[PDB]
């Protein structure tokens, strides 16, 4: 059967990528929380 | 910006109060409108966004002194 995750690299970066996070105040708020935690992976732009 | 340019007046936050004393948040808005003015000293026209209270000051001390007073306190910018 068709499952929930059907990958598309173009969709992934448009929805969760680094440049989309930086485009809004609430996205930059997410980046600040992940930096303060010390995450090695900041966005999906890192795993690529 | 919904601010008067002569007085600086802006909306204030208050309550609606019913007869049972239920209190709900409300806004008291400014009687704010746009009006065109003839400026005798400069021989021109200007359009200001002022309250009815600002118009009262204009009609007491004159337009020219009102703009000078408004620019000192930082209302016209």
């Amino acid at each position: 059967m068709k499952r929930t995750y059907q990958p598309s690299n173009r969709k992934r970066l448009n929805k969760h990528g680094f440049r989309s996070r930086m485009a809004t105040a609430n996205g930059r708020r997410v980046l600040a929380a992940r930096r303060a935690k010390g995450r090695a992976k900041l966005t999906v732009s890192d795993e690529f | 910006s919904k601010i008067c340019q002569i007085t600086g007046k802006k909306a204030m936050v208050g309550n609606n109060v019913s007869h049972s004393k239920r209190r709900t948040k409300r806004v008291f808005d400014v009687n704010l409108f746009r009006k065109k003015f003839y400026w005798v000293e400069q021989d021109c026209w200007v359009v200001l966004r002022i309250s009815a209270a600002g118009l009262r000051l204009i009609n007491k001390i004159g337009l020219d002194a009102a703009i000078k007073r408004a620019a000192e306190k930082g209302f016209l910018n």
Partner: protein, 52 residues
């Protein structure tokens, strides 16, 4: 609203005089045309002169 009539005006008149009008009559008709000027102390002193 106190104004200085710089011209002879229908009904209320006798130019160069102290007259009181409603704020709408002065701000919107007399001043924009140029038959009156607002009466401030800094303008009523310039009218205390008559030298006639």
């Amino acid at each position: 609203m106190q104004v200085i009539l710089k011209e002879d005006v229908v009904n209320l008149g006798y130019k160069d005089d102290i007259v009181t009008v409603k704020d709408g009559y002065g701000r919107n008709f007399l001043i924009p045309q140029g038959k009156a000027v607002i009466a401030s102390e800094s303008a009523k002193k310039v009218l205390a002169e008559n030298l006639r």
